[PDB]
Design a protein around this ligand. Sequence first.
Ligand code: YHD
Lengths: 233, 235, 242, 236, 229, 213, 209, 215, 195
Amino acid sequence: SYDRAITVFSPDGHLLQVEHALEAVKKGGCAVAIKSSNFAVLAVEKKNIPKLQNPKTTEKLIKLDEHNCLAFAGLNADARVLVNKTRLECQRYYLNMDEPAPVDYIAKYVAKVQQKFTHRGGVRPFGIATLIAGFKNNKEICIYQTEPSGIYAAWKAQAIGKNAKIVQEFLEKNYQENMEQKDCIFLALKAIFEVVELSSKNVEVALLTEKDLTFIEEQEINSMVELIDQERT
Amino acid sequence: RNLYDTDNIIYSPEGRLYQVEYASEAIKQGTCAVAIKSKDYVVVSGLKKCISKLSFPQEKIFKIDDYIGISMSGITSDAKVLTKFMQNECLSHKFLYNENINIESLVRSVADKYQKNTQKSSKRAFGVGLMIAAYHNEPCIFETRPNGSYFEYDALSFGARSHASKTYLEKNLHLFEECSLEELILHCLKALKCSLSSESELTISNTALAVVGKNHPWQEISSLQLEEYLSKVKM
Amino acid sequence: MARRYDSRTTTFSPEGRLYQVEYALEAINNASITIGLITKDGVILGADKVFISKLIDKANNYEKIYKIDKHIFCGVAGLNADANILINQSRLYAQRYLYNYNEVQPVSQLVVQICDIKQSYTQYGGLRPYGVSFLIGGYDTKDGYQLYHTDPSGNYSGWFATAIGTNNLTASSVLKQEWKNDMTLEEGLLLALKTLAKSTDTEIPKSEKIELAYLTNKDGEVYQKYLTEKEIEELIKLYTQK
Amino acid sequence: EYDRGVNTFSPEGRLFQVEYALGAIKLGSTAVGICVNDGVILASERRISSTLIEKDSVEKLLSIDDHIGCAMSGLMADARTLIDYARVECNHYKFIYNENINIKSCVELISELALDFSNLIMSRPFGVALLIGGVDKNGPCLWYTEPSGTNTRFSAASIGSAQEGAELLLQENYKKDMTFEQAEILALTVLRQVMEDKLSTSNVEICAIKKSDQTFYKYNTDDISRIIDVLPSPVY
Amino acid sequence: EYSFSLTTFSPTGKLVQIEYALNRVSSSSPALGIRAKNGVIIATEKKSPNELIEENSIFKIQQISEHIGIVYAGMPGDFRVLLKRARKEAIRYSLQYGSEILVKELVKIIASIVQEFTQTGGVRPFGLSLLICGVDVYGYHLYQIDPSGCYFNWMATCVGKDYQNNMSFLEKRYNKDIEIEDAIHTAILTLKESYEGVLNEKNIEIGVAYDNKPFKILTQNEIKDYLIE
Amino acid sequence: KRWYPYIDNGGTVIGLTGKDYVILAADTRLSLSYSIYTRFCPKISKLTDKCIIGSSGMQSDIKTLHSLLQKKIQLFVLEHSHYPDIHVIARLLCVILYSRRFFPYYAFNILAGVDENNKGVLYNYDSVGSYCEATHSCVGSGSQLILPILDNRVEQKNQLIKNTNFNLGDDINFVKDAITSATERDIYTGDKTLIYVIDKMGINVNTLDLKQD
Amino acid sequence: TTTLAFKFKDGIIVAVDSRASMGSFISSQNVEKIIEINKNILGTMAGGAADCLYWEKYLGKIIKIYELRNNEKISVRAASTILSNILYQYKGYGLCCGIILSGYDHTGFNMFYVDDSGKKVEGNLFSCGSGSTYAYSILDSAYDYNLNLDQAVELARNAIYHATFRDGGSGGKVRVFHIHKNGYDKIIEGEDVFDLHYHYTNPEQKDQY
Amino acid sequence: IYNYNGGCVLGMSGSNCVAIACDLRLGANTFTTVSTKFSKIFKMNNNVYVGLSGLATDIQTLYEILRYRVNLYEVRQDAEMDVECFANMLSSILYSNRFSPYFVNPIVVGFKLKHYVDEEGEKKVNYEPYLTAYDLIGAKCETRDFVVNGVTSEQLFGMCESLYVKDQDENGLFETISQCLLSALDRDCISGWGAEVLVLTPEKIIKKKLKARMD
Amino acid sequence: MDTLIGLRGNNFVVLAADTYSINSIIKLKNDDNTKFYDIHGNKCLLLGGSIGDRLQFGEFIRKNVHLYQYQNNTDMFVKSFAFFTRKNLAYYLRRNPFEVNCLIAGYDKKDGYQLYWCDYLSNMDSVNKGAHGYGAYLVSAILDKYYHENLTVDEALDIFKLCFEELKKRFLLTQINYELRIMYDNKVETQYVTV
Ligand SMILES: *[B]([O])([O])[C]([C]C1=[C][C]=C(C2=[C][C]=[C][C]=[C]2)[C]=[C]1)[N]C(=O)[C]1[C][C][C]N1[C]
């Protein structure tokens, strides 16, 4: 209804309307972010019907500011409304502080607004799990995983979305400390479609640096994919 | 029963509001508190609750104004809303005017605060009962039930084993002429001990006690002062 | 207290879905079919008129392909009643953008506005969702001809050809098998008839039936719509080659 | 919730939501606080889900103000809004009144927000358990806020999944008189008995609020090492 | 918490509350609209009442503006609130633009109001169907508004009880170039055949547009001459 | 015709602090433009056991500003269970005074009290939320006259800094000297004055009689 | 009222007088105009007394929360931007305050003159107050940016003196601070009877001018 | 109406065509020009031309509203909007700001579009001129012939009165309105840095920019 | 009080402004002032008038335009940017003064290089040459006499030099330091001139 608590404590102590929101994330698309010395790479899963549905949906890899990534995973309906609030927030902060919003501040806000929607009355919790890549006040890259419950934490290399457990356990065993520009692409690609089909059209990968977020084009994407199927043989 | 319980609006087929009858027994779980009215003094004592032998005893007695003090018994969070309301009410009256708030009028002002949380369905009845003990120009003791209701008493008891403490007070008519607070404070302390369970903790320096009277503003009884009172209780 | 009377239309299901949106999608899967097609000349929208009676005026009106702006138009498939709520809303949005920025609103920006309002109802408010989803084809000077398919849930997607409505699978199959990337306007119109005829398993359309419209920007965004007369030639042309 | 709202008394006199939230505070990492007459020490388990996490952004012992620090239990995301709220209220007090807030007073404004859903704005009870401590005046203080709103000052409390075991150990090994160092080794021993295999630096985040300096201090990897080496209880 | 929709999607994807409203519209007295080459006819049958009632005090065919009439078939209470609210739109429009409102914009405005009660919370859908007819600079019009809120453009229609065969009767007796005088003749006949126990005098009602004359409601003197055949 | 809402009721409040005390003195005359309302209207209202406030502006604002401040202080005591320090009170008065910056109180306030073992301390305001610790301050009609006198005896331009020590008894006599000088040199200064001495143990309200002209 | 700042070779030297006068009468002469906005950032009062004492200490409240939620120290650019915005909401309400925010942040040494009308500006040698013109005049003819600390405070003291000399509303004790790379120190909480020190060293005459 | 941004707008009616004209100046202060492209004649519709004169802020701000509502009316209508419906809308739009007025003096010019049969085999018919003139609070001063507003309203009234004849074709009407404007702008020192006569017929629209004196 | 000059050619747009800070009217405050608000989408916004209102207005425009270009992956057109700026300036006009004079400039794929001139009263109109402040009375005539069709970028700067040594020679407050913003060849070049 209008102004009723729809998220309330189950007799065992859990919040059922948040627990169900987590299961809405699992029915999404996997997203992977990898950190490095001074840049972060983000690779996500995209689904397009052949010959139709031009890839202008560009769900994941959302620009927030000059240097702020966002690769959500969950209900695309709630993705736009949550993202647009941050973009509204990012400029307001850059107006009240005259300095671009750091990655940590944006993650704290996204975690705040998400947790706000599971505490107010007559509002459904966001069915979205996001991860943000950006630079702090000091120039230092960071990735901030987020959950629909509002919990957030910084991660070196985290995977969210559909069957993120399999990707995470793989990503945990072969992550180097400071990988190369072409290594981070490979690790993200090798991990993103460990659960996704090996086709190069399914994955969309972009790399974030100190300036001018760069989208990786299909040339090397196809090139590295052909380097992975032979890895699987 | 099962149907006539969900909200604080439905009347049971016997005309009973269950959701305020249920909150009226949350006071029956708080620890005992006893108020005794003398000819010109009021003595309020309450048993503090220790949840563990590491924890500090919970505060039972609260001061409202110079000559007004209370002793909640119910949900602690609900009481804290009422003490702030009462404190902000006696202070405003002492600010808008220069008098002391009429204790009879103050109780009505807090007794209908219970009420406004009963007509609507988005609110709940306060789970706390109060013991408004004050000396305006004569000693007086009040009690507010979770349903909008208040009475002026000559002695009280709250909840835990109140029936045991009431028996001691119901048979004692001395309290009216009980001058010499020493003789009166013992009467209240004996009453509080009566409700207190045997083969358990005895009344110790961790039980609240305060007085208010003619020229005696609401004051706690200091532990050094209180300690000897407990000694005469053992007699 | 009407707590016992509430339906909790904005509450997650045990499997992480929303039942109200789940049922709204079912509502728009029983409505008349609508076809979208992007050609090099322009974008084609053609929907099927559900038969009611021969007494319908069927001369100067049809309730499937409306005009949202001079360069944007939509083909509705779902509850016709609340479509006009969103059509009027999107008409307001496309005209207030022109009020602020002194230029026509790009299609990709109107859709996100009309999808945010469509989504907002299933996020908070305790109201039922909009049981309506419509293709929104339009021409914008930035990214040319576009075609977007909305949803009661609020999530849209760009497309080259989509066939929402009843029996959409049999109309997406024919579109997927015959939509050449580069098509002329008359070629696309024939394809629209073929997918409309096959979706409702009729060999030939009747022109008291499916209606068609397009943009075909001629540096002035002509935005023409067919009266029934022009479709006999389209029906004649389909018969000759099929 | 099947036919009941948030404001509903059980036929036993207890509220339903708050007695349900009490079961939500028995899942966080164990935190142990000890109040001696020289300053409060706060200890906390660190449950790193994976080695990929940075172990720094995730934290258990924040500081409400320059002289207050707190622990957490239960819904971690639901506790940040309290600490953030308390930070504004603590700072707002320092502006209207030039002095620092009493920890007892800081807890009350947290407690009254914990039932803002009751409507004499939130909509459900907060499901956390705080362990606030500080050194305002009258010596150091240590409090403990429940979802039910009741707050009782403790001398040495414990929160988290293993709080029942930690309070069992504290209730025996705690003495009214200890030096600061006796508290530090006591807190680790309590955690050591209930934590996991390794008592490493990356497992606890002990912070102190000394009476002398009257300022919280988050122990770094160096200050935390010299306390583990003590091993006053080498019992396996 | 007191504003939540009572009209919700059924599992089979139907707004079942609307289907109930249409059930009651399909059990009221048949209203009927017919448009001709030079005017529009809206007709309804008002069942033969007791002599206690004053027949003129209740009229199912009310007038919106100079050239826009109306008739309903549903709950009389909702017609009055909708008719009164419909007249405000016809006046609010004329308070901005000089000319009298035209039917196409009036129907769209009213349909948006019928749709609101379908979606907004705590209210039920309107239990009636309207037939707004009028004369504009764009010729003659005859629209129908469902309880669902969707509106249709008609050349001839029925909304009342047993409108299935009632409208089938019109299909075989209607043509685009029908004379307005013949339209009333057909309008009487279709009501006459549907009305069991044919006594179609003192229990009928006609409203005419008459080729850009002001909308007029035929009093019974001007009706008995139409009951010969 | 416009109803200017500000009038000055005159009167002066003198503050002077020592090593371990503070002396707040004020007159009691309340007067209109040139006539006299009453000959005893106290301008000093005690706040805690060791903090008093004196105001010398418009008496309607002074009565409500002191009343508002004691209402806040007692509210502070109940919620925080300890009497506020003078620094706490002084800061709080700054917020209350500035809370109406765009319709300011027409009152100038001097706040006196003790915070340390003794540390006699004193604050002065100017009608809007601003306060600086001072060794001596006076506000009101006699502010222009008394302030030079207090300067010459507390601070020094004198070549040799005589009377370096300042016992409590002499300082009381000095304020009686000062407040009498303002009386015979100022129109609005009172006829009976109250002198407060916030010492270690408490406050004295010894009264002095002045000229009636 | 006088105010200075340098951003000299290895710090910032902020200098003010200590006079608060209403109308033509000196209400007080021992006011503190420097405010501990932060450990590294410190502001300055000018113009109206309360309109900047309240807001700077209100600004310190905002910074303390921000420095605690983000657990990184705020920058002078951000602190100044916060202050100018909140002072802009009171355009027509008659506020009057000229604030010079100087401090050390991650991006070096920063200074920002902030005025009651949202007048944020980045510079090296700001000065505000009634006697600011004379204070500017001395500094422009002696400023080097290569001055060491010993003669930087001497220049600041020299400028404050000459401003208080020519200006009626500037005077009293001279306060000269210094902002480190970590915190700040109070170099001079000083005096002002040193007219007979800089020029006219020997008291012999009236110092004709 | 202000000397600030001095500009005038003129409209005239012919036998079967109407002509709307204006000056192209945009004067920042009274005696200071900054632009000579500032056309004050806007195309609301195919045969509904509005001419806004006055402060350029309110000229543009009102034009956005007019264009925002004419399009909203037409799109919701699937029908071309006519002058007398639009003209009354402009009267109410100005009045809605009765106490915060739009400092403009609009002119509405365009054909009236009667709709009788025109024949046994025709649908729509001849057109009517429909000139009208307003002021800042929207008084519909409808007139069957020339209408003027602007700072040269008084200069234009005199010339139009002495030169306008009853009915003229497209060629004849253009010359009279051009002479009625050029020689009226030459008597104003705050307007007339180049004219723009726009005579339109039922079939075509003619835009001409005269070689006006620029002084 | 402060001079803004703009010149538009077929392949360039050059914006000129003095780098002075008139604040504390009895004197200057900064010798290298910042009035230009460069926008990401190859746009610039030059403000005159009061320094307090320049920051509040110009910065606000920059955020909203940047927010528009982030919500929508496009780059906001110069015509949209110009008329959106006028809307906000006129929106606040009857609620807050904002005595700021704009000079909108940018490059657009469809409309080329455009210059827009805006008064404190929102009198937006596209021009080939603009001039704000009191210096407009002394630089507008050079902008007419020495400007012709299809100038090249080098000649435009020669024109701007001719205007600058005019304000030094004849204008009351002889502004000496000016900053330019040359837009041409998909570049935003910045250079400072003196005297
Ligand atoms: B300056 O002369 O312009 C002056 C500046 C000033 C002085 C003092 C304080 C202050 C107040 C309280 C505690 C600490 C410090 C701040 C600012 N202002 C004035 O002279 C004007 C003239 C009349 C009113 N103001 C005092």
